Design an enzyme around this catalytic site. Structure first.
Site, PDB file in Angstrom:
ATOM      1  N   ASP A 166      29.200  -0.782   1.684  1.00  0.00           N
ATOM      2  CA  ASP A 166      28.103  -0.258   2.493  1.00  0.00           C
ATOM      3  C   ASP A 166      28.090  -0.904   3.881  1.00  0.00           C
ATOM      4  O   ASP A 166      27.053  -1.320   4.381  1.00  0.00           O
ATOM      5  CB  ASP A 166      26.766  -0.484   1.773  1.00  0.00           C
ATOM      6  CG  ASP A 166      25.615   0.266   2.424  1.00  0.00           C
ATOM      7  OD1 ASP A 166      25.876   1.272   3.120  1.00  0.00           O
ATOM      8  OD2 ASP A 166      24.451  -0.156   2.243  1.00  0.00           O
ATOM      9  N   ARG A 170      23.406  -1.330  10.336  1.00  0.00           N
ATOM     10  CA  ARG A 170      22.100  -1.640   9.728  1.00  0.00           C
ATOM     11  C   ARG A 170      22.188  -2.750   8.687  1.00  0.00           C
ATOM     12  O   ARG A 170      21.171  -3.267   8.233  1.00  0.00           O
ATOM     13  CB  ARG A 170      21.481  -0.387   9.090  1.00  0.00           C
ATOM     14  CG  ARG A 170      22.303   0.099   7.932  1.00  0.00           C
ATOM     15  CD  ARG A 170      21.982   1.526   7.461  1.00  0.00           C
ATOM     16  NE  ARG A 170      22.963   1.828   6.428  1.00  0.00           N
ATOM     17  CZ  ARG A 170      23.999   2.627   6.616  1.00  0.00           C
ATOM     18  NH1 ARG A 170      24.138   3.253   7.767  1.00  0.00           N
ATOM     19  NH2 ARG A 170      24.871   2.824   5.648  1.00  0.00           N
ATOM     20  N   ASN A 171      23.407  -3.080   8.274  1.00  0.00           N
ATOM     21  CA  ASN A 171      23.611  -4.129   7.284  1.00  0.00           C
ATOM     22  C   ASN A 171      24.265  -5.369   7.864  1.00  0.00           C
ATOM     23  O   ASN A 171      24.871  -6.150   7.130  1.00  0.00           O
ATOM     24  CB  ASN A 171      24.400  -3.598   6.084  1.00  0.00           C
ATOM     25  CG  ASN A 171      23.570  -2.663   5.212  1.00  0.00           C
ATOM     26  OD1 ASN A 171      22.341  -2.739   5.200  1.00  0.00           O
ATOM     27  ND2 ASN A 171      24.235  -1.759   4.504  1.00  0.00           N
ATOM     28  N   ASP A 184      23.350  -7.549   2.948  1.00  0.00           N
ATOM     29  CA  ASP A 184      23.087  -6.485   1.971  1.00  0.00           C
ATOM     30  C   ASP A 184      24.232  -6.191   1.016  1.00  0.00           C
ATOM     31  O   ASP A 184      24.913  -5.174   1.109  1.00  0.00           O
ATOM     32  CB  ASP A 184      22.579  -5.210   2.658  1.00  0.00           C
ATOM     33  CG  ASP A 184      21.219  -5.422   3.337  1.00  0.00           C
ATOM     34  OD1 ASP A 184      20.428  -6.261   2.850  1.00  0.00           O
ATOM     35  OD2 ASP A 184      20.943  -4.777   4.372  1.00  0.00           O
TER      36      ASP A 184
END
Length: 304
Positions: A166, A170-171, A184
């Site tokens: 992922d 955003r991570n 994350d």
């Protein structure tokens, strides 16, 4: 397993006493959990009396079983991968007789997308943004440096035979000192001793960052993380742009089969764009490895 009947086993080397953890201001609230700032007294073995600022990941009131399962899995993954300068590192956990708290390093400058967007060159900032930081505007050198650190984090990750699955702006989190940290690990998996990870038919990986073998062939390897890393680079060099602008995920499936790839970001060199394109090679084994990306990125950063 079955989280509704699973009792989290004691793990003394990671366990942190609840009475020494003081919850503070929220840092993030997603669909599947929550993260708050906290002061953890004694968590640093060196300063047993000293309180250190940390971040705490925990469930929300409307948590699903999968949410709890994800939180446990993230915690366990972080125990196994070990410490790296460019990864949000696990510090401790409160696992017994109360809500599960997963305690990790605090990144005071927040997520990478907003970090980049606040640090954009003036005018592209239209409209009026109160959250900009003009004194810290991003140079080309800063962007390459950002990519290099993240490449180092993934090189280390791959060397532990861990797939993140992922990867995305955003991570990524940014520390007080501008250190890029991969975060994350809720979807991360250990692929030691297997040739690849087997995806479900309809997975939980954001489509615009997914390699095609995963989308269409249900296979995930380190080379699939490399594909994602390429999308991340594109996010970095657009200073927090969102990928395949104007293309809904439902149309992206066929475009990918047809060989569609994103265009070069405005203030990026062809050399860096080609590196992105190399990451998006159709044949996974023809993408560079994270080790090769580190070597190339280091060379580029040195010249600058």
């Amino acid at each position: 397993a079955g989280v509704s009947e699973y009792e989290l086993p004691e793990d003394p080397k990671w366990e942190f006493p609840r009475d020494k953890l003081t919850l503070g201001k929220p840092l993030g609230e997603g669909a599947f959990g929550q993260v708050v700032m906290a002061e953890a007294v004694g968590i640093d073995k060196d300063k047993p009396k000293e309180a250190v600022t940390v971040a705490v990941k925990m469930l929300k009131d409307d948590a699903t079983e999968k949410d709890l399962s994800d939180l446990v899995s993230e915690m366990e993954m972080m125990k196994m991968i070990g410490k790296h300068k460019n990864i949000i590192n696990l510090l401790g956990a409160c696992t017994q007789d109360g809500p599960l708290y997963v305690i990790v390093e605090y990144a005071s400058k927040g997520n990478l997308r907003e970090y980049l967007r606040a640090r954009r060159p003036p005018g592209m900032e239209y409209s009026y943004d109160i959250n900009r930081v003009p004194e810290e505007q991003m140079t080309f050198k800063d962007l390459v440096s950002c990519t290099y650190q993240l490449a180092r984090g993934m090189e280390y990750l791959a060397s532990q035979k861990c797939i993140h699955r992922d990867l995305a702006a955003r991570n990524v989190l940014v520390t007080e000192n501008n250190v890029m940290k991969i975060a994350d690990f809720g979807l991360a998996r250990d692929i030691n001793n297997i040739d690849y990870y087997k995806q479900t038919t309809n997975g939980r990986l954001p489509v615009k960052w997914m390699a095609p073998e995963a989308l269409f062939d249900r296979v995930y390897t380190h080379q699939s993380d490399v594909w994602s890393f390429g999308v991340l680079m594109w996010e970095i060099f657009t200073l927090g742009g969102s990928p395949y602008p104007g293309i809904p995920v439902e149309e992206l499936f066929k475009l990918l089969k047809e060989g569609h790839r994103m265009d070069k970001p405005a203030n990026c060199t062809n050399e860096l764009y080609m590196m992105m394109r190399d990451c998006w090679h159709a044949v996974p084994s023809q993408r560079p490895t994270f080790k090769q990306l580190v070597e190339d990125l280091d060379r580029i950063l040195t010249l600058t």
